[PDB]
UniProtKB/Swiss-Prot annotation, chains A, B:
Family note: Belongs to the 14-3-3 family.
Protein name: 14-3-3 protein zeta/delta
GO molecular function, one term: cadherin binding
Transmembrane segments: none
Curated annotation (Swiss-Prot), chains C, D:
Functional note: Packages the positive strand viral genome RNA into a helical ribonucleocapsid (RNP) and plays a fundamental role during virion assembly through its interactions with the viral genome and membrane protein M. Plays an important role in enhancing the efficiency of subgenomic viral RNA transcription as well as viral replication. Attenuates the stress granules formation by reducing host G3BP1 access to host mRNAs under stress conditions.
The species this protein was found in: Severe acute respiratory syndrome coronavirus 2
Compartments where found: Virion; Host cytoplasm; Secreted; Host extracellular space
Name of protein: Nucleoprotein
Subunit (UniProt): Homodimer, homotetramer, homooligomer with RNA. Both monomeric and oligomeric forms interact with RNA. Interacts with protein M. Interacts with protein E. Interacts with NSP3; this interaction serves to tether the genome to the newly translated replicase-transcriptase complex at a very early stage of infection. Interacts with host NLRP3 and ABHD8; these interactions disrupt the association between NLRP3 and ABHD8, increasing NLRP3 stability, ultimately leading to increased inflammasome activation.
Top-level taxonomic group: Viruses
Processing after translation: ADP-ribosylated. The ADP-ribosylation is retained in the virion during infection.
Family of the protein in this entry: Belongs to the betacoronavirus nucleocapsid protein family.
Amino acid sequence: MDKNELVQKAKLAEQAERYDDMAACMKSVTEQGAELSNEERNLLSVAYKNVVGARRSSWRVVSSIEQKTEGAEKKQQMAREYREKIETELRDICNDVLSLLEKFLIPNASQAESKVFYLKMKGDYYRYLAEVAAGDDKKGIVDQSQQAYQEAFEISKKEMQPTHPIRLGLALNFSVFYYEILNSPEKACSLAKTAFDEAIAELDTLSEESYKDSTLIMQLLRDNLTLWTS
Amino acid sequence: MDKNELVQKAKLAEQAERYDDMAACMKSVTEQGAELSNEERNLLSVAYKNVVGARRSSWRVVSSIEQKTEGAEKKQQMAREYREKIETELRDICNDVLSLLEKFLIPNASQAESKVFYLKMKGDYYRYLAEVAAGDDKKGIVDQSQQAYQEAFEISKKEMQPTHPIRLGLALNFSVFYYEILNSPEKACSLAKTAFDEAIAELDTLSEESYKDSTLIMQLLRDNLTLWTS
Amino acid sequence: SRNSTPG
Amino acid sequence: SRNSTPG
């Protein structure tokens, strides 16, 4: 229906913790073809993060059971087939978001922070595909994630202040990508440490609108550094 | 579509927190027509409690928003329509459980304990229908809930010890029924107090296997009594 | 809020 | 466990 109606229904779905509904509303908003407001952008992101996150969690649980059932052929087969079912849902969700990003969001982004936001999202959803990719497809998926993060990184470093919440969150996820997907603790820590240190030096550039998100992400950056250097 | 296989898949689904899957597996097991083991009964009950519980939670959120948007016509109408959509899901879930109870679970129950368990669950799911019933249908739904609880109540008092977790849990939910559905606080308090006091009087009837469940439910009974007399 | 049985 | 950005 009307864009404003869909956005109101997405907020209702979020309150009700019905994230399938809320992703469906925000997808319909995106498909209308107009650049998303900051509020609409955030609602889209929250929705799909919760939808995919449910599958990521289930996949880890079942994949682990599959691993620990060697020698019990029937039980292992059933865990494998359930894992594969969950993977298919997970892949379809990622491909859903990635398609919206290619067709609507990235091409229509007129401001640098919008472009960085959507390239970060692209990096994120390819990273979730990389988490479950095996064999032949993985290197190509990993490279798509890296190229999106890297372009987002260069743009943010040129256009956005160190305390900008989107720049900080990009550093956080790109650093996780280096740690978990590229298995390089050193580059992950260097990226997180620089982001934290450069923001720490400019706290007077925070706004009443940005400081809660920005200071949360700095705490997550340091938490990752603490974890990775113990 | 083999039973032992369906049960194993339900356990996987539970581990994965995919309760729709887990309810579907145990619906299929129930429809095979044989009396459920205690393990199968608990899987069925846990699955549907989570499935219906998500809708009940969402319904309360949206119903609260609907009430708080009085005087805001567009917002309230959108909340109403979303509440009605959730209600349809909730009714369909309850109708599925109630049909399994009528067709398989109650007729197949060969022991007093599981007779009480399934009549309690019939009372519960008619109570959940009552929570969202309006108009002409509500009286008959409330009557169905009460009649199922009452029969369960009579069998539990005749056949089970006062510390039995199923007898105690039946008293807890029947008391909530009186308080919330029948708007009868004095009856609710009398029922909860009697159940607590009769268990306190015979704590030697606790078993090591289930004393934790029993004492938990006794605390919940007194917590309701405290809330309703405060 | 009042409690019903967890199961 | 490590953290990525919420939502």
